[PDB]
Protein backbone atom coordinates (compact mmCIF):
# COMPACT_ATOMS: atom_id res chain seq x y z
CA UNK A 1 0.00 0.00 0.00
CA UNK A 2 3.02 2.34 0.37
CA UNK A 3 6.69 2.76 -0.53
CA UNK A 4 9.51 3.78 1.84
CA UNK A 5 11.63 6.85 1.14
CA UNK A 6 15.30 7.08 2.18
CA UNK A 7 14.24 9.43 5.03
CA UNK A 8 12.07 6.59 6.42
CA UNK A 9 8.89 8.48 5.51
CA UNK A 10 6.32 6.49 3.58
CA UNK A 11 4.53 7.50 0.42
CA UNK A 12 1.10 5.96 -0.37
CA UNK A 13 1.23 3.84 -3.54
CA UNK A 14 -1.82 5.56 -5.08
CA UNK A 15 -2.52 9.27 -4.97
CA UNK A 16 -4.99 11.66 -6.64
CA UNK A 17 -3.63 13.83 -9.45
CA UNK A 18 -5.10 17.29 -9.82
CA UNK A 19 -3.82 18.83 -13.07
CA UNK A 20 -6.86 20.11 -15.06
CA UNK A 21 -9.31 19.24 -12.26
CA UNK A 22 -10.66 22.78 -12.59
CA UNK A 23 -13.75 23.73 -10.62
CA UNK A 24 -14.25 20.07 -9.60
CA UNK A 25 -10.88 20.00 -7.70
CA UNK A 26 -12.20 20.46 -4.15
CA UNK A 27 -14.96 17.88 -4.58
CA UNK A 28 -12.57 15.39 -6.15
CA UNK A 29 -10.06 15.74 -3.31
CA UNK A 30 -12.71 15.32 -0.63
CA UNK A 31 -14.30 12.30 -2.40
CA UNK A 32 -10.94 10.64 -2.86
CA UNK A 33 -9.86 10.95 0.77
CA UNK A 34 -13.20 10.73 2.64
CA UNK A 35 -15.00 8.12 0.51
CA UNK A 36 -12.39 6.23 -1.52
CA UNK A 37 -9.65 5.93 1.10
CA UNK A 38 -6.96 7.94 -0.73
CA UNK A 39 -4.17 9.21 1.55
CA UNK A 40 -2.06 10.94 -1.13
CA UNK A 41 -2.77 14.08 -3.21
CA UNK A 42 -0.48 15.40 -5.95
CA UNK A 43 -0.73 19.06 -6.95
CA UNK A 44 1.40 22.07 -7.98
CA UNK A 45 1.27 25.86 -7.95
CA UNK A 46 1.41 25.89 -11.79
CA UNK A 47 -1.83 23.80 -11.96
CA UNK A 48 -3.77 26.82 -10.65
CA UNK A 49 -5.89 24.55 -8.35
CA UNK A 50 -4.06 24.76 -5.01
CA UNK A 51 -6.68 26.96 -3.30
CA UNK A 52 -9.32 24.37 -4.27
CA UNK A 53 -7.12 21.50 -3.10
CA UNK A 54 -6.87 23.38 0.21
CA UNK A 55 -10.68 23.51 0.50
CA UNK A 56 -10.96 19.81 -0.27
CA UNK A 57 -8.27 18.79 2.23
CA UNK A 58 -9.88 20.95 4.91
CA UNK A 59 -13.26 19.26 4.32
CA UNK A 60 -11.65 15.82 4.31
CA UNK A 61 -9.95 16.45 7.68
CA UNK A 62 -13.11 17.78 9.36
CA UNK A 63 -14.15 14.22 10.18
CA UNK A 64 -11.06 13.45 12.25
CA UNK A 65 -8.62 12.09 9.55
CA UNK A 66 -5.29 13.33 10.91
CA UNK A 67 -2.82 15.39 8.90
CA UNK A 68 -0.07 12.84 9.54
CA UNK A 69 -2.13 10.20 7.71
CA UNK A 70 -2.17 12.29 4.51
CA UNK A 71 0.64 12.76 2.00
CA UNK A 72 0.51 16.08 0.14
CA UNK A 73 2.88 17.01 -2.70
CA UNK A 74 3.40 20.34 -4.38
CA UNK A 75 5.94 21.60 -6.91
CA UNK A 76 8.16 24.66 -7.40
CA UNK A 77 7.50 26.21 -10.78
CA UNK A 78 10.15 27.20 -13.32
CA UNK A 79 9.77 30.95 -12.74
CA UNK A 80 10.59 30.44 -9.04
CA UNK A 81 13.79 28.37 -9.59
CA UNK A 82 16.17 30.86 -8.03
CA UNK A 83 17.37 30.63 -4.40
CA UNK A 84 15.57 33.77 -3.20
CA UNK A 85 12.25 32.74 -4.83
CA UNK A 86 11.96 29.30 -3.18
CA UNK A 87 10.50 30.47 0.14
CA UNK A 88 7.92 32.97 -1.20
CA UNK A 89 6.70 30.25 -3.57
CA UNK A 90 6.38 27.71 -0.74
CA UNK A 91 4.63 30.27 1.47
CA UNK A 92 1.99 30.89 -1.18
CA UNK A 93 1.55 27.15 -1.80
CA UNK A 94 1.10 26.50 1.93
CA UNK A 95 -1.36 29.38 2.25
CA UNK A 96 -3.41 28.15 -0.73
CA UNK A 97 -3.43 24.55 0.58
CA UNK A 98 -4.27 25.76 4.12
CA UNK A 99 -1.37 23.60 5.32
CA UNK A 100 1.60 24.17 7.60
CA UNK A 101 3.96 21.64 5.98
CA UNK A 102 4.21 19.60 2.78
CA UNK A 103 5.08 15.92 2.69
CA UNK A 104 6.90 16.42 -0.60
CA UNK A 105 8.11 19.49 -2.54
CA UNK A 106 9.39 18.83 -6.07
CA UNK A 107 11.30 20.83 -8.66
CA UNK A 108 8.59 20.86 -11.34
CA UNK A 109 11.08 20.98 -14.25
CA UNK A 110 14.89 21.54 -14.17
CA UNK A 111 14.59 24.74 -16.18
CA UNK A 112 14.33 28.37 -15.08
CA UNK A 113 11.89 30.65 -16.95
CA UNK A 114 11.82 34.41 -16.92
CA UNK A 115 8.78 36.13 -15.53
CA UNK A 116 6.09 36.51 -18.21
CA UNK A 117 7.67 33.81 -20.39
CA UNK A 118 5.77 32.92 -23.54
CA UNK A 119 4.89 29.51 -24.97
CA UNK A 120 6.94 28.70 -26.93
CA UNK A 121 9.56 30.81 -25.17
CA UNK A 122 10.94 33.88 -26.89
CA UNK A 123 14.64 34.67 -27.09
CA UNK A 124 16.13 35.15 -23.63
CA UNK A 125 13.22 33.62 -21.72
CA UNK A 126 14.91 30.36 -20.66
CA UNK A 127 17.41 31.45 -17.97
CA UNK A 128 20.46 29.75 -16.45
CA UNK A 129 19.41 27.43 -13.60
CA UNK A 130 21.54 27.40 -10.44
CA UNK A 131 20.48 23.83 -9.63
CA UNK A 132 22.89 23.54 -6.71
CA UNK A 133 21.77 26.84 -5.11
CA UNK A 134 18.05 26.09 -5.50
CA UNK A 135 18.56 22.60 -4.03
CA UNK A 136 20.48 24.05 -1.05
CA UNK A 137 17.53 26.36 -0.31
CA UNK A 138 15.13 23.39 -0.58
CA UNK A 139 17.29 21.45 1.90
CA UNK A 140 16.73 24.34 4.30
CA UNK A 141 12.98 23.78 4.02
CA UNK A 142 13.49 20.25 5.32
CA UNK A 143 15.76 21.40 8.18
CA UNK A 144 13.04 23.90 9.20
CA UNK A 145 10.26 21.24 9.05
CA UNK A 146 8.28 23.07 6.34
CA UNK A 147 8.77 20.09 3.95
CA UNK A 148 9.21 16.46 5.07
CA UNK A 149 11.00 15.39 1.85
CA UNK A 150 12.21 17.10 -1.35
CA UNK A 151 12.57 15.77 -4.89
CA UNK A 152 12.41 16.43 -8.59
CA UNK A 153 10.37 15.90 -11.69
CA UNK A 154 11.30 15.58 -15.37
CA UNK A 155 14.98 14.79 -14.92
CA UNK A 156 17.53 12.97 -17.08
CA UNK A 157 20.29 10.62 -16.03
CA UNK A 158 22.84 13.41 -16.61
CA UNK A 159 20.86 15.88 -14.48
CA UNK A 160 20.35 13.33 -11.68
CA UNK A 161 24.12 12.77 -11.63
CA UNK A 162 24.68 16.56 -11.39
CA UNK A 163 22.23 16.78 -8.48
CA UNK A 164 23.57 13.77 -6.58
CA UNK A 165 27.08 15.25 -6.75
CA UNK A 166 25.94 18.38 -4.81
CA UNK A 167 23.02 17.23 -2.62
CA UNK A 168 23.42 16.82 1.12
CA UNK A 169 19.85 15.45 1.23
CA UNK A 170 19.34 13.38 -1.98
CA UNK A 171 15.98 13.68 -3.80
CA UNK A 172 13.48 11.40 -2.14
CA UNK A 173 11.38 11.09 -5.30
CA UNK A 174 11.81 11.57 -9.04
CA UNK A 175 8.37 11.99 -10.63
CA UNK A 176 8.32 11.10 -14.32
CA UNK A 177 5.86 10.37 -17.10
CA UNK A 178 5.46 6.59 -17.16
CA UNK A 179 2.80 4.32 -18.69
CA UNK A 180 2.72 1.58 -21.32
CA UNK A 181 4.20 3.15 -24.43
CA UNK A 182 6.52 5.39 -22.39
CA UNK A 183 8.26 3.27 -19.75
CA UNK A 184 11.44 5.39 -19.41
CA UNK A 185 13.35 2.36 -18.10
CA UNK A 186 16.51 4.46 -18.44
CA UNK A 187 15.43 6.98 -15.78
CA UNK A 188 13.89 4.20 -13.66
CA UNK A 189 17.22 2.32 -13.50
CA UNK A 190 19.16 5.50 -12.67
CA UNK A 191 16.75 6.25 -9.81
CA UNK A 192 16.89 2.69 -8.51
CA UNK A 193 20.70 2.79 -8.37
CA UNK A 194 20.68 6.13 -6.52
CA UNK A 195 17.94 4.88 -4.08
CA UNK A 196 15.35 7.38 -5.39
CA UNK A 197 11.63 6.43 -5.42
CA UNK A 198 9.79 6.94 -8.69
CA UNK A 199 6.23 8.27 -8.97
CA UNK A 200 4.58 7.78 -12.36
CA UNK A 201 2.71 10.82 -13.62
CA UNK A 202 0.24 10.48 -16.50
CA UNK A 203 -0.06 6.75 -15.60
CA UNK A 204 -3.13 6.39 -17.82
CA UNK A 205 -1.51 8.22 -20.76
CA UNK A 206 -3.07 11.55 -19.65
CA UNK A 207 -6.07 12.96 -21.53
CA UNK A 208 -3.97 13.27 -24.72
CA UNK A 209 -3.06 9.61 -25.19
CA UNK A 210 -5.33 7.85 -22.75
CA UNK A 211 -4.76 4.08 -22.90
CA UNK A 212 -8.13 2.91 -21.49
CA UNK A 213 -9.27 1.92 -25.02
CA UNK A 214 -5.96 0.39 -26.10
CA UNK A 215 -6.72 -3.15 -27.44
CA UNK A 216 -4.14 -5.03 -25.35
CA UNK A 217 -5.15 -3.13 -22.21
CA UNK A 218 -8.80 -3.96 -22.97
CA UNK A 219 -7.94 -7.67 -23.45
CA UNK A 220 -6.15 -7.86 -20.11
CA UNK A 221 -8.99 -5.97 -18.43
CA UNK A 222 -11.45 -8.45 -20.00
CA UNK A 223 -9.36 -11.46 -18.90
CA UNK A 224 -9.02 -10.29 -15.28
CA UNK A 225 -12.49 -8.72 -14.88
CA UNK A 226 -11.00 -5.35 -14.02
CA UNK A 227 -11.28 -1.91 -15.61
CA UNK A 228 -8.71 -0.72 -18.13
CA UNK A 229 -7.71 2.00 -15.65
CA UNK A 230 -7.16 -0.61 -12.93
CA UNK A 231 -4.95 -2.61 -15.27
CA UNK A 232 -2.83 0.43 -16.17
CA UNK A 233 -2.41 1.34 -12.49
CA UNK A 234 -1.71 -2.18 -11.25
CA UNK A 235 0.90 -2.55 -14.00
CA UNK A 236 2.73 0.47 -12.59
CA UNK A 237 2.61 -0.87 -9.04
CA UNK A 238 4.11 -4.14 -10.27
CA UNK A 239 7.01 -2.18 -11.80
CA UNK A 240 7.60 -0.58 -8.38
CA UNK A 241 6.38 3.00 -9.03
CA UNK A 242 3.71 4.91 -7.15
CA UNK A 243 0.91 6.33 -9.30
CA UNK A 244 -1.08 9.56 -9.22
CA UNK A 245 -4.07 9.07 -11.55
CA UNK A 246 -6.28 12.15 -12.03
CA UNK A 247 -10.05 12.05 -12.23
CA UNK A 248 -12.92 14.40 -11.55
CA UNK A 249 -15.50 11.56 -11.83
CA UNK A 250 -16.50 9.97 -8.53
CA UNK A 251 -16.81 6.46 -9.95
CA UNK A 252 -13.33 6.52 -11.49
CA UNK A 253 -11.78 8.04 -8.36
CA UNK A 254 -13.18 5.08 -6.41
CA UNK A 255 -12.26 2.45 -9.01
CA UNK A 256 -8.72 3.72 -9.59
CA UNK A 257 -7.52 2.86 -6.05
CA UNK A 258 -8.89 -0.75 -6.21
CA UNK A 259 -5.56 -2.07 -7.39
CA UNK A 260 -4.63 -4.15 -4.29
CA UNK A 261 -5.06 -7.82 -3.43
CA UNK A 262 -5.07 -9.00 -7.06
CA UNK A 263 -2.37 -9.11 -9.71
CA UNK A 264 -1.67 -9.01 -13.38
CA UNK A 265 -0.19 -12.38 -14.48
CA UNK A 266 3.43 -12.24 -15.67
CA UNK A 267 2.58 -13.01 -19.30
CA UNK A 268 0.10 -10.12 -19.39
CA UNK A 269 2.52 -7.82 -17.57
CA UNK A 270 5.19 -8.70 -20.16
CA UNK A 271 2.83 -8.00 -23.06
CA UNK A 272 2.05 -4.55 -21.65
CA UNK A 273 5.77 -3.90 -21.17
CA UNK A 274 6.10 -4.95 -24.82
CA UNK A 275 4.15 -1.93 -26.13
CA UNK A 276 6.80 0.17 -27.90
CA UNK A 277 8.06 3.40 -26.28
CA UNK A 278 6.68 5.80 -28.89
CA UNK A 279 6.99 9.36 -27.70
CA UNK A 280 6.09 11.18 -24.52
CA UNK A 281 2.80 12.95 -23.95
CA UNK A 282 4.70 15.76 -22.17
CA UNK A 283 7.85 16.71 -24.15
CA UNK A 284 8.41 20.16 -22.67
CA UNK A 285 8.81 21.66 -26.16
CA UNK A 286 6.27 24.43 -25.71
CA UNK A 287 7.84 25.43 -22.36
CA UNK A 288 11.53 25.42 -23.15
CA UNK A 289 12.25 25.05 -26.89
CA UNK A 290 12.99 28.01 -29.15
CA UNK A 291 13.63 26.40 -32.55
CA UNK A 292 15.06 29.57 -34.14
CA UNK A 293 17.29 30.94 -31.35
CA UNK A 294 17.73 28.24 -28.69
CA UNK A 295 19.26 27.65 -26.23
CA UNK A 296 17.15 24.50 -26.54
CA UNK A 297 16.42 24.10 -30.28
CA UNK A 298 14.58 20.74 -30.09
CA UNK A 299 12.75 18.57 -27.57
CA UNK A 300 15.62 16.05 -27.57
CA UNK A 301 17.82 18.78 -25.98
CA UNK A 302 15.37 19.09 -23.07
CA UNK A 303 16.08 15.36 -22.39
CA UNK A 304 19.86 15.57 -22.92
CA UNK A 305 19.50 13.38 -26.04
CA UNK A 306 18.64 10.41 -23.74
CA UNK A 307 15.14 10.06 -25.31
N1 LIG B 1 5.22 17.80 -14.88
C1 LIG B 1 4.63 16.95 -14.07
O1 LIG B 1 5.16 16.63 -13.00
C2 LIG B 1 3.29 16.39 -14.41
C3 LIG B 1 2.62 16.31 -15.65
C4 LIG B 1 1.33 15.76 -15.75
C5 LIG B 1 0.76 15.28 -14.61
N2 LIG B 1 1.37 15.38 -13.38
C6 LIG B 1 0.66 14.88 -12.21
O2 LIG B 1 0.23 13.52 -12.49
C7 LIG B 1 -1.21 13.50 -12.51
C8 LIG B 1 -1.74 12.42 -13.41
O3 LIG B 1 -1.41 12.70 -14.79
P1 LIG B 1 -2.44 13.30 -15.82
O4 LIG B 1 -3.40 14.18 -15.15
O5 LIG B 1 -1.61 13.85 -16.94
O6 LIG B 1 -3.19 12.06 -16.40
P2 LIG B 1 -3.68 10.55 -16.07
O7 LIG B 1 -3.91 10.41 -14.62
O8 LIG B 1 -2.73 9.62 -16.72
O9 LIG B 1 -5.02 10.51 -16.91
C9 LIG B 1 -6.09 11.44 -16.65
C10 LIG B 1 -7.11 11.28 -17.74
O10 LIG B 1 -7.69 9.95 -17.68
C11 LIG B 1 -9.07 10.02 -17.37
N3 LIG B 1 -9.43 8.91 -16.48
C12 LIG B 1 -9.18 8.81 -15.13
N4 LIG B 1 -9.45 7.63 -14.63
C13 LIG B 1 -9.85 6.88 -15.72
C14 LIG B 1 -10.29 5.54 -15.82
N5 LIG B 1 -10.35 4.73 -14.76
N6 LIG B 1 -10.68 5.12 -17.05
C15 LIG B 1 -10.58 5.97 -18.08
N7 LIG B 1 -10.18 7.25 -18.12
C16 LIG B 1 -9.86 7.66 -16.87
C17 LIG B 1 -9.31 11.43 -16.83
O11 LIG B 1 -10.62 11.91 -17.09
P3 LIG B 1 -11.55 12.43 -15.93
O12 LIG B 1 -10.83 13.38 -15.05
O13 LIG B 1 -12.63 13.15 -16.78
O14 LIG B 1 -12.14 11.27 -15.22
C18 LIG B 1 -8.28 12.23 -17.63
O15 LIG B 1 -8.75 12.49 -18.94
C19 LIG B 1 -1.62 14.95 -12.83
O16 LIG B 1 -2.98 15.26 -12.61
C20 LIG B 1 -0.64 15.68 -11.92
O17 LIG B 1 -1.07 15.62 -10.56
C21 LIG B 1 2.65 15.89 -13.27
Author numbering: 13 to 319
Authors' description from the paper:
Aldo-keto reductases (AKRs) are ubiquitous in nature and are able to reduce a wide range of substrates, from simple sugars to potentially toxic aldehydes. The AKR superfamily consists of generally monomeric proteins, typically ranging from 30 to 40 kDa, that are NAD(P) (H)-dependent and share a common (α/β)8-or TIM-barrel (triose phosphate isomerase). Recombinant ZmAKR4C13 efficiently reduced methylglyoxal and small aldehydes but showed poor activity toward aldoses larger than four carbons. The maize ZmAKR4C13 can thus detoxify small-aldehyde stress metabolites and is expressed at sites and times in embryos conducive to a role in stress tolerance and possible signaling.
To identify mechanistic features potentially affecting activity and roles of the ZmAKR4C13, we solved its crystal structure in two space groups at a resolution of 2.3 Å (P212121) and 1.45 Å (P21), respectively. The protein folds into a (α8/β8)-barrel with two additional α-helices (H1 and H2) packed against the α7-helix from the barrel. The residues Asp54, Tyr59, Lys87, and His120 correspond to the typical catalytic tetrad of AKRs according to structural comparison with the well characterized AKR1C9 (64). Although two and four monomers compose the asymmetric unit of the P21 and P212121 crystals, respectively, analysis of their interfaces using the PDBePISA program did not indicate formation of stable quaternary structures in solution. Two molecules of ethylene glycol were found at the substrate-binding site for ZmAKR4C13, allowing us to identify additional points of potential substrate anchoring based on hydrophobic interactions and hydrogen bonds. The first molecule occupies the same binding site as does acetate in the P212121 crystal and that of butanol in HvALR1. Replacement of a cysteine by the bulkier leucine at position 294∗ from Loop C seems to hamper the binding of C3-OH groups that are in the same orientation observed for glyceraldehyde in HsAKR1B1. Supporting this hypothesis, the orientation of the second ethylene glycol molecule bound in the ZmAKR4C13 active site displays an angular shift compared to the first one. Relative orientations of the two ethylene glycol molecules, which approximate aldose fragments, support the interpretation that Leu294∗ prevents longer C3-aldoses from adopting a conformation favorable for catalysis. Analysis of the active site, its modifications, and interaction with alternate substrates, indicates that the spatial bulk of Leu at position 294∗ of ZmAKR4C13 is instrumental to preventing aldoses with 4-C or more from serving as effective substrates under physiologically relevant conditions.
